[PDB]
Each structure stands twice: as C-alpha cells, then as structure tokens.
Write a protein that binds this ligand. Structure first.
Ligand SMILES: [Mg+2]
Ligand SMILES: [Mg+2]
Ligand SMILES: [Mg+2]
Ligand SMILES: [Mg+2]
Ligand SMILES: [Mg+2]
Ligand SMILES: [Mg+2]
Ligand SMILES: [Mg+2]
Ligand SMILES: [Mg+2]
Ligand SMILES: [Mg+2]
Ligand SMILES: [Mg+2]
Ligand SMILES: [Mg+2]
Ligand SMILES: [Mg+2]
Ligand SMILES: [Mg+2]
Ligand SMILES: [Mg+2]
Ligand SMILES: [Mg+2]
Ligand SMILES: [Mg+2]
Lengths: 177, 188, 260
RNA sequence: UUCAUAAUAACUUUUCGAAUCGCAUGGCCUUGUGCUGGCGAUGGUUCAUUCAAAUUUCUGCCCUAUCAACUUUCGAUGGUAGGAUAGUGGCCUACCAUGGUUUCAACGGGUAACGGGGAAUAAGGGUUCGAUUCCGGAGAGGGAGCCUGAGAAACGGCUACCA
RNA sequence: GAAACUGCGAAUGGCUCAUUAAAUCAGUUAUCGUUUAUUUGAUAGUUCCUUUACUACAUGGAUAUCUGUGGUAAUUCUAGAG
C-alpha cells in the first residue's frame, strides 16, 4: 500500500507504492510511535529505520495515537484531540477512527525516517527543502542566530526579495517583542 | 441533570403537577463531594457566572481555630468520630461540614508552650516578664488538657469542603465539648 | 427568553419618546448606561426626532462618530446612549447646550440652556455607603460613584456635580419647604414645594407637593428630586415651569396667545 | 440585621495587581538615545449603576359530583444537620414528628384551553370570542443528557434511544 | 488586503400554540435570599520575603494560515512532515 515517508532534517518527503505482501509484513502488529528496521521493508532500504507515526485506513479513516486496537472504533472527539477539528466552541462530535495497531486494513502508512542508511533515496536522503520563512520574535531570531543578544538584532532579520517583472521589492517580517 | 426545582414535587394540597417546561440549566444540581482523608486532591468546577468552585475530596490537612485565646493553626485531620446527620459518613470516614474530627494537636501544644509554658500532659528576660505579666491566667479547662495528654484534639469542622475546598473548623471547647462527649459516651 | 433581550419593538417603546406608531417595526433600544431605559432617552431619538438635525440612522451615526455630541463633558459616540434626566448635551457646532428636563406634559423637551451653567450638573443621591478600606462614597441617580463626599450628605438628598472634575461642589438637604421636581408617574414635569413627607413605617415614603399656582398633589419619594429653594431654583426651569395648567386653561392659553 | 466597613489569628494544590496596541512624538537640557512627557484603544481586581436572570407575597381562572375524600412505604406536611444550589427552599440525603388540602368543591376527569392587553355585540346588566401585529410562557419530530459562556438543558450546537 | 489564529455575537430576531387549569399570566410586593459579559462611575504602590549579586532597554515553547505528501465514493472528513 501507499507509504508516505518524510525526512525531517532535510525537510523532504515522498510517496512509495509497495505491492509485495512480505515487505509490509513487519509493519503488522506495530503501533504508532514504534521503530522498525529498514532491512526488512526493502532491499534498497538498507541502514534506514522507520518511526511509525499515523496512517490512513482503506476506508479513509486515520489512525489515532494511543488507541492500541487493530480495528476501528467510534469516539467522542473534542478540541485538543487529533482526528477532528471543532467548528463551534466546545463542539464535541462522535466520529469513527482507526485504531493505533497497524493491520492489513491500512491503506497509507505515514513513516518518519530516523537513521540515515547506506543506499540514498532519490530526492529525500539527497535533496533538502528550504524553510519557507525564518524566525519572527526578536529573541527567537537571536537564538536562531546565536547573536550575543546585545548586538542590535534589528538589522539581522531576513529579507525576501521578489521581482514584480518591473520593480524589485523587499519584504521582511515585523519583529515582535 | 439532578434538578432542584419545585415542579416535580406535589402541590401543598397533594395534587400531581403535570409536566411543564422541561428542566433548565439554572436549576441544576451537581454530585455530592463526599470528601475523604489523605492525598489532597481538589477539583475545580466552573459554576454559573464563572466563580470557580472547589471540590475538596481526599483532604488531609486544614486550618483550625481556638476560640478561647483565639489562635488558628494549620493541622492534620485524623479521622472523623461523629457526624450529626448520618453515622454512615462516620463509618466511611466521609468529611462534610459540622462533622467532628480528631486533631494531631501538636501545633497548639508547642504554641501553648512558647506562649505560656505550663508543660501539659503531666530564657530571655523579655519572655519571662511577659509570662509574669500573664500571671498564670491560662486556666483553660480540664477536658482539653485531658485530650492534650491523650494527644488528639476534638474539633468540629465549620467550612464546607464541598463548595469552598478548604477544611477549616474550630476545636470543641466549653460546654460544646461537654455536649458532644456525652454523645460520644453514648457511642461508647 | 434565554438571556438578555436586545430588540425594542416600536409599540413597546415608552410613550414619552412618543415616536410615530407607523414608519417602522422597531424602536431604538437604549444600550446599558447611566439611566433606566424606560426613563432614559437615546441620542438617536434626541437628534433625529427632537432636534431634526439628522434625517435617519446613518445621519445620526455620522453626527455621533465625528464627536460633536458631548454628554456631560464626554463624547459618547454610540447611537443608543441613554442620555437621561438632567444630563447635558453639548454641540460645539452651533455652540449649543441642552439640559434634559421634563416638560409638564411629561416629556423630554428640548431645553436650550446657557454655556455658563452648562459647566455643571445636578444629581439625586440614591445611596450613601462605605466602600473598602473604610472610604465613604455616594451613588447618585446617574450611577456616578463620587468618592469622599461631605459627611452629612444623606440619602434622597441632592448635589451639584461640577461635571468637569466630577467632584462635590455643593448640595441641598431634603426637608420641608424646598423647591422640588417630579420624575415619574402622572405628575411628570411638575415643580413645587415639599409641604409634608409622611414616613410610612415599612416602605414607600410619600411627599406632598404644592406648586406656585397653589395646587397640591402627592408623590412617592423615589419619584422626587429636590431642585433648589423656593424662588431660587438651582437650574434654569423649562418654559412654563411645570404648573400643569388645566386642559380648559390650556385651551384658554391657545385662544389668548394667538397671532396669525 | 451577624448590614456596610474595620481589626486579630491563621489558611490557600496562591486570583488580581498592564512583558498589550494607535496617533502625536512636546518639554529639560544632566546634548544622550539621556531624563521625562499628551490624547486615546484594548484589557484588569473590587464596589456600584444599567440591560437583566432566577426565584417570591396577596387576589383573581372555563365545564364537571354519572369525580367526596385526596397525599405519605418511592417526600406527602413539619423539625434538625448535612449535600447541592449563584442563592432561600424536602431541592436531595440521614434521623425524627404524623402531618398538609377538602362541601368556601379539595383530588380526579374534560377543555376542538396557551394567559393577558383586547374583539364582536350594546339602554342599563351582560353573552360569546381572544391561534395572530404588543407583553409574558412554552416548543423546535417525541423524549432524555451535556460542552462552550455572563447568559442554552440551545436544537439554522452536539450525544444517545424511539418514529 | 484574501486566508487563518485571536476577540465578540451566534441564547437577539422570526415562527407556532402542542403540552400546561393556582399551572402560565395580570395587577401588586420582596430579594436583609442570589448570579449578572456588556454600558457608565470610581477603584490597587507591598508581585522584594532577609532586599550585600536579577531579563525588566522586554522571558519560553508550541500552534494555526502557508509550503508539500496523501487517504475516502462521498461530509464545513483532515493524518504525516517543515
Ligand atoms: Mg425571542
Ligand atoms: Mg459581613
Ligand atoms: Mg438547610
Ligand atoms: Mg391545545
Ligand atoms: Mg392570544
Ligand atoms: Mg384563551
Ligand atoms: Mg389550537
Ligand atoms: Mg409573542
Ligand atoms: Mg427552547
Ligand atoms: Mg414538523
Ligand atoms: Mg460570550
Ligand atoms: Mg432541545
Ligand atoms: Mg430550522
Ligand atoms: Mg433559534
Ligand atoms: Mg453543531
Ligand atoms: Mg385539570
């Protein structure tokens, strides 16, 4: 089934389709938050290791963390919980949700890749996706720079330049606090 | 869901009032606190108009006051010995208002010792002159000395742990104690 | 109703706003403020209807927003502000000043009143209490809480707020033989002198009032507002001074004072 | 009035006591980013006031006795203490007392009954109507349960059963 | 100036008369028996705790929006990553 792999440090991710019945066999009976070695999931996944963080059932129902069940269940979700977003304040809703134990009923497995392996993936182990915007708060910018705080963090704010086609103009965030 | 409205009650005459205006939210009643002893665990409940209320189940220590010389001290509640409403709470050690409890009684003891120093149960010149000016007025009655020798004070709680969250009360003293000890001797 | 009510249908509006029963389904509900909505007067009613300076709601909104209205020395940019009895409405444009006093028919009449006296306001004392840390304070009918009042100022009394600093300037003590105004019931707008104040142990004080024309009536003490000493009112009384001429006398006034 | 308020002793899984925005950015010279400094906007504890909300006293309701006794073990009337309540209150619990209404019609039954301001009718007295332009109450298919808030037992908010 | 977070209203208004015969309601009282966003008027030095060593010229981390990967036949369904 579909596997959504995401490498955080490179900030990259990809989707992988697997049809073999035995590569996914190790994913069976493994709950969210566990670690599975990449040797048993693919001969091109040597050295890799996979944290399992969420997924989607064949019916589209995602799996909630901490359900410890290989089946679906109807739960009364509210604000703070995942698998649900409230429209009105305090709007509890009873919705179906897949359990946290991975079984054959899953359709997508969301997988963090934790340890860099031997054979590099195409654009995940190799490429890096830049962060779309930097820090905004003054001390946050200082920490991101290691700026020896009494150093006039005013100027060191990042500045993104965009060209309208005729005029090149700068846009930089306003510093809070 | 526990209502406290008067509609469900029969009329003064005795007629069975027909159902009308399904019960509201400004008529609600919540579960009893039925507090216990030990491992302080107070749960806030958001009541009408904010005004955080505090359920005080499992409460072990609280403030207690002495009326004669009028001094208050934090001290431990050690079990309940009598309840004027239901002895079932006494057997279950459920602590509500007006219940009668026992007190570790030490803080009162060395407060007395540093205040009068009469050595119950059996220095700087300023303190000596204070004691001399006192001139042994601490002629506090005999039964309180009796349970001071015993070590556990007899107190009646006055705060409402169900609402306030505190565990405050006052020691039995004077004819108060008298009355209740008779009742206790009735239990004995 | 579950909660507060925020709509005032036109027929349910007080008959002293005396709007047109047609040309509208609703009426301006006064927002919360210094006066009871049954007793108060919204600014939109005072401008659109009483003064006709505006024409409709948008015009009143534009008038209030640009800070030309000043209620008791403050701007009050909200459309339905409850400008109540004895409040002062200042318009720097046309440099005009109004004080809301009932005309004897019992209505919030347009009273054009001078700038010099417009600096201050009068108020009835509704409570005298002791707030925290032992500070005495006085609550007037506007809801103004004046701190540190004169020690012998009592309830039902009257006082003269300077309306600039908002402190105590002078006061008049409630007692017999004193010029007085009426602020409710059948005797709206009437002005007289207190002849007697029967105590009525247990509640609802009553006072007897005799006006200049030597007519006599009786009114509840909650309904009473001392306004000064006989012959020397502390404010500028409206035209007619609230004598309550009889309907036949009003007809005779129409017949006599008549020129076309 | 045990009221307002003040005071002492203590208590708190210690609430609040501005790390928030706009405009104008003046004055002092300690001539520096230095010292101060106006008009507002949002907040914020408490006490008032207002919009209110809950209860609450007296009196007033259509037909019917082919409805004369009704209510209490399961609260019926009262007492006390506690719990809950925002708060009084059998509102609920524990233990007691055996009480409360009734021929001045209680209780039960019926209402093709929402109550009222009012409408028709008109010598005077009245008879009938009032679902609906205003004020109240209740309801969102019938039932129960609840989060959020100051305010809902909300339903153009949710939970469950029944249809 | 979209979007989203925040704040506020969504409990007003509108409709219907099904239930309800001391029930609602009307007139008249009471709250010294209580909650009250808002509006309006006032309202606080002590947050130090042994003060002879602290950020007050400003303390911390998430988090939506967004960038990208999906799932379901579909619903104001949203899980993973930055
Ligand atoms: Mg309505
Ligand atoms: Mg007091
Ligand atoms: Mg009681
Ligand atoms: Mg009917
Ligand atoms: Mg009707
Ligand atoms: Mg009718
Ligand atoms: Mg009908
Ligand atoms: Mg209506
Ligand atoms: Mg409803
Ligand atoms: Mg229908
Ligand atoms: Mg709100
Ligand atoms: Mg409902
Ligand atoms: Mg609808
Ligand atoms: Mg609705
Ligand atoms: Mg909803
Ligand atoms: Mg009946």
């Amino acid at each position: 089934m579909k596997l959504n792999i995401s490498y955080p440090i490179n900030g990259t991710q990809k989707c992988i389709e697997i049809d073999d019945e035995h590569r996914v066999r190790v994913f069976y009976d493994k709950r969210i938050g566990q670690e599975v070695d990449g040797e048993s999931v693919g001969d091109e996944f040597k050295g890799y290791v996979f944290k399992i963080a969420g997924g989607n059932d064949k019916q589209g129902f995602p799996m909630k963390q901490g359900v410890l069940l290989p089946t679906r269940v109807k739960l009364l979700l509210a604000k703070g919980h995942s698998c649900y977003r409230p429209r009105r304040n305090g709007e509890r809703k009873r919705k179906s949700v897949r359990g946290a134990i991975v079984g054959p009923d899953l359709a997508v497995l969301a997988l963090i890749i934790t340890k860099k392996g031997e054979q590099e993936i195409e654009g995940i182990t190799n490429d890096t996706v830049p962060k779309r915007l930097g820090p905004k708060r003054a001390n946050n910018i200082r920490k991101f720079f290691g700026l020896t705080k009494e150093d006039d963090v005013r100027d060191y704010v990042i500045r993104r330049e965009v060209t309208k086609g005729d005029k090149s103009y700068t846009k930089a965030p306003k510093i809070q606090r | 869901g526990i209502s406290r409205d008067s509609r469900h009650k029969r009329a003064a005459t005795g007629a069975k009032r027909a159902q009308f205006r399904k019960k509201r939210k400004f008529e609600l009643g919540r579960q009893a606190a039925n507090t216990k002893i030990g491992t302080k665990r107070i749960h806030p409940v958001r009541t009408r108009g904010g005004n955080q209320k505090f359920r005080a189940l499992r409460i072990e220590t609280g403030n207690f006051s002495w009326a004669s010389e009028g001094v208050a001290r934090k001290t431990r509640i050690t079990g309940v010995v009598y309840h004027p409403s239901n002895n079932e709470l006494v057997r279950t050690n459920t602590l509500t208002k007006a219940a009668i409890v026992q007190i570790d009684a030490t803080p009162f003891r060395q407060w007395y010792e540093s205040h009068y120093g009469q050595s119950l149960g059996k220095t700087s010149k300023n303190t000596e002159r204070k004691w001399a000016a006192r001139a042994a007025e601490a002629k506090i009655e005999h039964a309180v000395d009796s349970q001071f020798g015993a070590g556990r004070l007899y107190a009646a709680i006055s705060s409402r742990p169900g609402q306030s969250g505190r565990c405050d009360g006052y020691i039995l003293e004077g004819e108060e104690l008298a009355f209740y000890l008779r009742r206790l001797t009735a239990k004995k | 109703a579950r909660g507060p009510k925020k709509h005032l249908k036109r027929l349910a509006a007080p008959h002293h706003w005396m709007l047109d029963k047609l040309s509208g389904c609703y009426a301006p509900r006064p927002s919360a403020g210094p006066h009871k909505l049954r007793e108060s007067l919204p600014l939109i009613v005072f401008l659109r209807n009483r003064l006709k300076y505006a024409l409709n709601g948008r015009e009143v909104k534009a008038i209030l927003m640009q800070r030309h209205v000043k209620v008791d020395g403050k701007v009050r940019t909200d459309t339905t502000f409850p400008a109540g009895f004895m409040d002062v409405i200042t318009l720097e444009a046309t440099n005009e000043n109004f004080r809301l006093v009932y005309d004897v028919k019992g209505r919030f009449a347009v009273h054009r009143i001078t700038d010099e006296e417009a600096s201050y306001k009068l108020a009835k004392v509704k409570k005298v209490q002791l707030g925290k840390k032992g500070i005495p304070y006085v609550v007037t009918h506007d809801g103004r809480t004046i701190r540190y009042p004169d020690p012998n100022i009592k309830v039902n009394d009257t006082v003269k707020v300077d309306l600039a600093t908002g402190t105590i300037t002078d006061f008049i003590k409630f007692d017999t033989g004193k010029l007085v105004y009426v602020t409710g019931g059948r005797n709206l707008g009437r002005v007289g002198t207190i002849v007697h104040r029967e105590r009525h142990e247990g509640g609802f004080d009553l006072v007897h009032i005799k006006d200049s024309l030597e007519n006599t009536f009786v009114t509840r003490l909650n309904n009473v507002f001392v306004i000064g000493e006989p012959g020397r009112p502390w404010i500028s009384l409206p035209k007619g001074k609230g004598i309550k001429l009889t309907i036949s006398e009003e007809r005779d006034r129409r017949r006599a004072q008549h020129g076309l």
